[PDB]
Amino acid sequence: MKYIQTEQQIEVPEGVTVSIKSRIVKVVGPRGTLTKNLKHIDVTFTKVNNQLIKVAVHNGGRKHVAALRTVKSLVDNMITGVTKGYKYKMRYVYAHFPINVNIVEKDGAKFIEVRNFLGDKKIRNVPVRDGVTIEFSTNVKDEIVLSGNSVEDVSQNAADLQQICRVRNKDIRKFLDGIYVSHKGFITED
Amino acid sequence: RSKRSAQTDKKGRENKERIFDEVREALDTYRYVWVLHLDDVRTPVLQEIRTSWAGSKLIMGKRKVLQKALGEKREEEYKENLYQLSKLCSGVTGLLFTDEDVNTVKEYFKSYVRSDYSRPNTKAPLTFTIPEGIVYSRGGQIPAEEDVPMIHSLEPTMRNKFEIPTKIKAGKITIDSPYLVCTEGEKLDVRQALILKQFGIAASEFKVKVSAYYDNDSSTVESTNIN
Amino acid sequence: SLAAISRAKSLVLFQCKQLKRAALGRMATIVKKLRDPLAYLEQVRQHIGRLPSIDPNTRTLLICGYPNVGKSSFLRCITKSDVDVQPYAFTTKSLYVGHFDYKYLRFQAIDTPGILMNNIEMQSIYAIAHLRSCVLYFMDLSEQCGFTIEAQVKLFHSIKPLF
Amino acid sequence: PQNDYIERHIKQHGKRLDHEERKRKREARESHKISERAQKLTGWKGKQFAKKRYAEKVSMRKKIKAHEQSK
RNA sequence: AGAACUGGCGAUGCGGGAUGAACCGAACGUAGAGUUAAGGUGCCGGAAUACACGCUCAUCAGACCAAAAGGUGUUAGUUCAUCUAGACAGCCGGACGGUGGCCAUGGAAGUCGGAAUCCGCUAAGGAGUGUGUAACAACUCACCGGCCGAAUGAACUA
RNA sequence: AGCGAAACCACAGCCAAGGGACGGGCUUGGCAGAAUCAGCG
RNA sequence: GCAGUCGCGACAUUGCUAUACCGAAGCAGAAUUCGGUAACCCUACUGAU
Numbered sequence: 001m002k003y004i005q006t007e008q009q010i011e012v013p014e015g016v017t018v019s020i021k022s023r024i025v026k027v028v029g030p031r032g033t034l035t036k037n038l039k040h041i042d043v044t045f046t047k048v049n050n051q052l053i054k055v056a057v058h059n060g061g062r063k064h065v066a067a068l069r070t071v072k073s074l075v076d077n078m079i080t081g082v083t084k085g086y087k088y089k090m091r092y093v094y095a096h097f098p099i100n101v102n103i104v105e106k107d108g109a110k111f112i113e114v115r116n117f118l119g120d121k122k123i124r125n126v127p128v129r130d131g132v133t134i135e136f137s138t139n140v141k142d143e144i145v146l147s148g149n150s151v152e153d154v155s156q157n158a159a160d161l162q163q164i165c166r167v168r169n170k171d172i173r174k175f176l177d178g179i180y181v182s183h184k185g186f187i188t189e190d
Numbered sequence: 191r192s193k194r195s196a197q198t199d200k201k202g203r204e205n206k207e208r209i210f211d212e213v214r215e216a217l218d219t220y221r222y223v224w225v226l227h228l229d230d231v232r233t234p235v236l237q238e239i240r241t242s243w244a245g246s247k248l249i250m251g252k253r254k255v256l257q258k259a260l261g262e263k264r265e266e267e268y269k270e271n272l273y274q275l276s277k278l279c280s281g282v283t284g285l286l287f288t289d290e291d292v293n294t295v296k297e298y299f300k301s302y303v304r305s306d307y308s309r310p311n312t313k314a315p316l317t318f319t320i321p322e323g324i325v326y327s328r329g330g331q332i333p334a335e336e337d338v339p340m341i342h343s344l345e346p347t348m349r350n351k352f353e354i355p356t357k358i359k360a361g362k363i364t365i366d367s368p369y370l371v372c373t374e375g376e377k378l379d380v381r382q383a384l385i386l387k388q389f390g391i392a393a394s395e396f397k398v399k400v401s402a403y404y405d406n407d408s409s410t411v412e413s414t415n416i417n
Numbered sequence: 418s419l420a421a422i423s424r425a426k427s428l429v430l431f432q433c434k435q436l437k438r439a440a441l442g443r444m445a446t447i448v449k450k451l452r453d454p455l456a457y458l459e460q461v462r463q464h465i466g467r468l469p470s471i472d473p474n475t476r477t478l479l480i481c482g483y484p485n486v487g488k489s490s491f492l493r494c495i496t497k498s499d500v501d502v503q504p505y506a507f508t509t510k511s512l513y514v515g516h517f518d519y520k521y522l523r524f525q526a527i528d529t530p531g532i533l534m535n536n537i538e539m540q541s542i543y544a545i546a547h548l549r550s551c552v553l554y555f556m557d558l559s560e561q562c563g564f565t566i567e568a569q570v571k572l573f574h575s576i577k578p579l580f
Numbered sequence: 581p582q583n584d585y586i587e588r589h590i591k592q593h594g595k596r597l598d599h600e601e602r603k604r605k606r607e608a609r610e611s612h613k614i615s616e617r618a619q620k621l622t623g624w625k626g627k628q629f630a631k632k633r634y635a636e637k638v639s640m641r642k643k644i645k646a647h648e649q650s651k
Numbered sequence: 652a653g654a655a656c657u658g659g660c661g662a663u664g665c666g667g668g669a670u671g672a673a674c675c676g677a678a679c680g681u682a683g684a685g686u687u688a689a690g691g692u693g694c695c696g697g698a699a700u701a702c703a704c705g706c707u708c709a710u711c712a713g714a715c716c717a718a719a720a721g722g723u724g725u726u727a728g729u730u731c732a733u734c735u736a737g738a739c740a741g742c743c744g745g746a747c748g749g750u751g752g753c754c755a756u757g758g759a760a761g762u763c764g765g766a767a768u769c770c771g772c773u774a775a776g777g778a779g780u781g782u783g784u785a786a787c788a789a790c791u792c793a794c795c796g797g798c799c800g801a802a803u804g805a806a807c808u809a
Numbered sequence: 810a811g812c813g814a815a816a817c818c819a820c821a822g823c824c825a826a827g828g829g830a831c832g833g834g835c836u837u838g839g840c841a842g843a844a845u846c847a848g849c850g
Numbered sequence: 851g852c853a854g855u856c857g858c859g860a861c862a863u864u865g866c867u868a869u870a871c872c873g874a875a876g877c878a879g880a881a882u883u884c885g886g887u888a889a890c891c892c893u894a895c896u897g898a899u
Contacts, residue, residue, distance in 0.1 A: 591784095611723055612723060614721095614722080614723080615721095615722050615723055615724080616722090617722090618721055618722045619721095619722060619724080620710095626721095627718095629721085630718095630720065630721050630722095631720090631721095633720090633721055633722090634719095634720060634721065637720095637721080
C-alpha cells in the first residue's frame with residue numbers, strides 16, 4: 001500500500017567481511033570470495049555495528065518490497081557459501097546400460113562427460129562453470145559430488161547435468177536411466 | 191488479490207473458558223496438587239498414568255489459561271501462595287489434583303517408567319546400525335528370522351527424508367554398508383527419532399517427573415525434583 | 418455397451434443457424450449420454466490390450482494346484498518369463514504365460530493363481546477346461562502351502578471328473 | 581507384458597529418484613500456471629477455459645456447502 | 652414498420668473535429684485594435700513538456716456492442732470473526748482404548764464398497780481427508796500440546 | 810530514301826488508409842530522379 | 851427445440867426427438883491419440899539507353 005519505509009536485517013558472522021559499493025556487494029571469508037551485483041534491485045544498505053546490515057526501500061510499492069525481501073536471502077546465501085560452502089551429491093542409476101560419467105579437461109573448461117547413457121552413441125557433456133569443483137563420491141557407487149561457494153553456479157551446474165541426459169521420449173517409469181540429485185547441503189555441515 | 195489459498199471443528203476460547211471454570215470449581219475439593227511437564231508421552235502411557243489412580247483429577251490445557259485459572263499473581267490467586275505454582279510452571283501444562291499421601295504419590299511418580307522412542311537431544315542408548323544388507327522393520331537389530339524385510343513403499347522417505355543411502359534391489363530396501371545412525375551416548379537429532387519411530391523400536395525409557403507440588407489447606411508451594 | 422455404440426453411430430439465415438445448432442446439440446447430447454458406455458469401454462480397453470498371449474493351438478502345459486507354494490520358481494526356470502514368487506496368500510490374479518523351446522518344438526507354460534468361488538480361480542478352471550493342455554497339479558508334503566493334505570486330496574478328487 | 585508389467589516395474593525398482601519431488605514442484609507451479617493460462621489463450625479457447633473455470637468453481641462451492649451441511 | 656411535435660438540411664457561409672451532408676459553437680457589408688465560443692496548449696500546430704491529488708505495463712493498452720464471469724495482476728472500501736487468557740504462518744510432539752464394530756468375502760481392519768456413523772477418556776482425536784502396502788505396516792489433515800512474534804483469515808463492494 | 814492519315818481528346822497518370830453512401834484532383838502517410846527503345850503479360 | 855428439477859434465476863440437471871519440436875494416455879519396443887509453437891488500356895511487368 002505504498003509503505004513509507006521497509007527494511008530487512010542481515011547478520012554477518014565475524015568469520016566473514018562485507019564491502020558494499022553503490023550496488024555491488026563483496027563477501028570475503030575462509031572459503032573464498034563473492035562479488036554479487038544487485039544493480040537491478042534498487043535497495044539501500046546500512047551498517048549498524050559491522051555485524052548487522054539493513055537493506056531498505058523507501059516509498060516502495062508491493063513489488064518493490066517483495067524484491068527487497070529477496071536481498072536478505074541473497075546475502076544469506078552468499079554468507080553461507082563463503083563460510084560453509086554448498087555441495088550437491090547426485091547419484092546416477094541405470095537399468096541395463098551402465099551410465100559412465102567421466103571428467104576430462106577438453107578445451108580446458110573442465111568438461112564433464114557422460115557416456116553410454118541409454119546406449120546412445122552421442123556423448124553428452126556440460127562445461128563446468130568457474131568456481132565449482134566436481135569429484136566422484138568415495139564408497140558411493142555411481143555418485144558425483146559438486147562443491148563450491150556460489151549456490152547459483154552449483155545449482156545451475158547440477159540442473160544442467162540432469163537436463164543434458166534426459167531420456168529421449170521413452171516411457172518415464174520404465175527407462176530410469178539418468179542422473180538425479182540424491183542430496184544437497186553444505187561442505188562443512190554442522 | 192494474490193492472497194494465500196474434514197469434519198472436525200475448533201474448540202477455541204469457549205473450551206478455554208470451560209476448562210478454566212472446571213479448574214476453578216474443582217481445585218478447592220482436593221488436598222495436593224502436582225504440576226508435570228509431560229512433554230512427550232504416548233496416549234497409552236497417558237491412559238495408564240490416568241488409570242493408575244482413578245480418584246485423581248487430571249487437568250490440562252493452554253499454559254496461559256491454566257495460569258489464569260490458578261491465579262497469575264497474588265492479585266488473582268485462587269488460594270494463598272497458589273500463584274507460585276503458575277509462576278514456577280513453564281513446560282507442558284500437566285496438572286493433577288489428589289487426596290492420596292504426598293509421599294506415596296511422589297514415590298509412584300518416580301517409580302513409573304515406560305519404554306519409548308529416544309527423543310531429540312537425548313543420548314543414544316546404543317550404537318544403532320542398519321546392517322550392510324537388506325534392511326528390516328526392526329532396523330536389523332534382531333535376526334532376520336524374527337524380523338521382516340522392509341517394503342519398498344517407504345523407500346523414498348528413507349532415501350531423502352532420513353538421508354541414508356537406501357536403494358531398491360528386486361523391490362527390497364538395501365544399503366551397501368553397516369550404516370550407523372549414532373554412536374553410544376551420541377546426541378540424537380530429529381532424523382534419528384523419526385527413524386526409530388518408523389522402525390517401531392522403543393529405544394529408551396521415559397519416566398514422568400513432577401515439576402512442583404502444592405498443599406491446599408496449608409496453601410503452600412514446594413519443589414520435588416524426582417528425576 | 419456395443420449395442421449403445423452401434424445405436425449412437427446409426428442415429429446420426431436464423432432458421433439455418435438454429436437447425437445447425439439443433440444438429441450439433443443433438444450430437445453432443447448423444448455423446449454425453451454415451452459417457453457411461455464410453456467410460457466402460459475405456460476401462461475395459463486399458464486392460465484387454467496386454468492380455469496374455471495364450472495360443473490354444475500350440476503345445477500348452479498348465480501348472481495348477483492350491484495357492485503358490487513356490488511352484489512359480491519351476492515356471493520361471495523352465496521359461497524366462499519372470500513371475501512373482503512371493504509366498505503370500507494369493508500371488509497372481511490372472512494367467513501368466515511363458516514360451517520356451519524343447520526338441521526344436523515350441524511350448525508355452527501357463528500358471529494358475531490358485532484353486533481352492535472366485536473369479537481368479539474360475540478363470541484358470543475355464544482355461545484348463547476349454548484349452549488343450551498337459552496339466553501338472555502341485556501338492557506339498559512339508560509345512561508349506563498351509564492347506565491340509567486331506568483338503569488337497571479332496572479338491573483333487575472333486576476336480577477330477579473334468580480335469 | 582504379463583498383464584501387470586507397468587506395476588511390476590514400479591514395485592520392483594520404483595519411480596525416478598526424484599519423481600515425487602518433480603510432481604510436487606509441478607503441483608506447486610500449477611497455482612501460477614492457472615493464472616498464466618487465464619491471462620493467455622485468447623479466443624474460443626479462452627472462452628472455453630473461462631467457462632470451465634466457472635463451472636469448476638461452482639461445483640467446488642456446492643461440494644463445500646454440502647460437506648459443511650453434512651455435519 | 653405507423654401516427655405525431657419540435658430544431659439542421661433545404662435555400663447555408665465560418666471555427667474544431669486526420670476527414671464525414673445529420674456532431675458543439677456561430678448565421679455573413681469592406682477594414683483596424685481588443686476580448687471570446689466550441690476545440691486545444693510536445694512536434695506537424697498558433698498555445699504551459701502548467702501546478703495538485705492516484706490509478707496502468709497492456710505481448711499491436713489508452714487517447715473510439717455478445718461479456719454474465721475468471722486472473723497466486725494491482726489498488727481502495729463493507730460484514731463476520733480470532734488477539735498479549737497469545738492474529739495467520741513456520742518448526743517439533745500427541746493424534747487414543749473398545750475396534751480387526753456388522754456385512755457383501757481367501758482380504759477392504761480408516762481409505763475397491765453398504766448401512767451406521769456407536770460409546771469411554773480427555774487436550775483432541777473423523778469406524779478416519781489422503782499417500783500406500785495383497786490386509787496389516789508407516790506417514791498424514793483437522794483436532795489439540797511446546798519455541799517465534801500482533802494483527803490476521805474468510806465472504807462481498809469497487 | 811521519300812510522300813503521308815484517320816479514330817479519339819473537360820484535364821493528367823505511384824500506391825495504403827478514412828470518406829460513417831462515390832473517390833481520380835478531400836484527408837493522413839510512404840515516397841516520387843529528366844527523357845527514352847524493346848518482349849507482351 | 852419444448853418441458854422440469856434449482857419475484858426476477860448463473861454452470862450443472864432429467865424426460866422425447868504435411869513435416870519438425872514439446873507434456874501426457876497403462877508411453878515394455880514400434881505404431882497410435884490428445885493440447886501448444888502454425889504450415890492504340892492507367893498503375894503495370896522486365897531487359898536496357
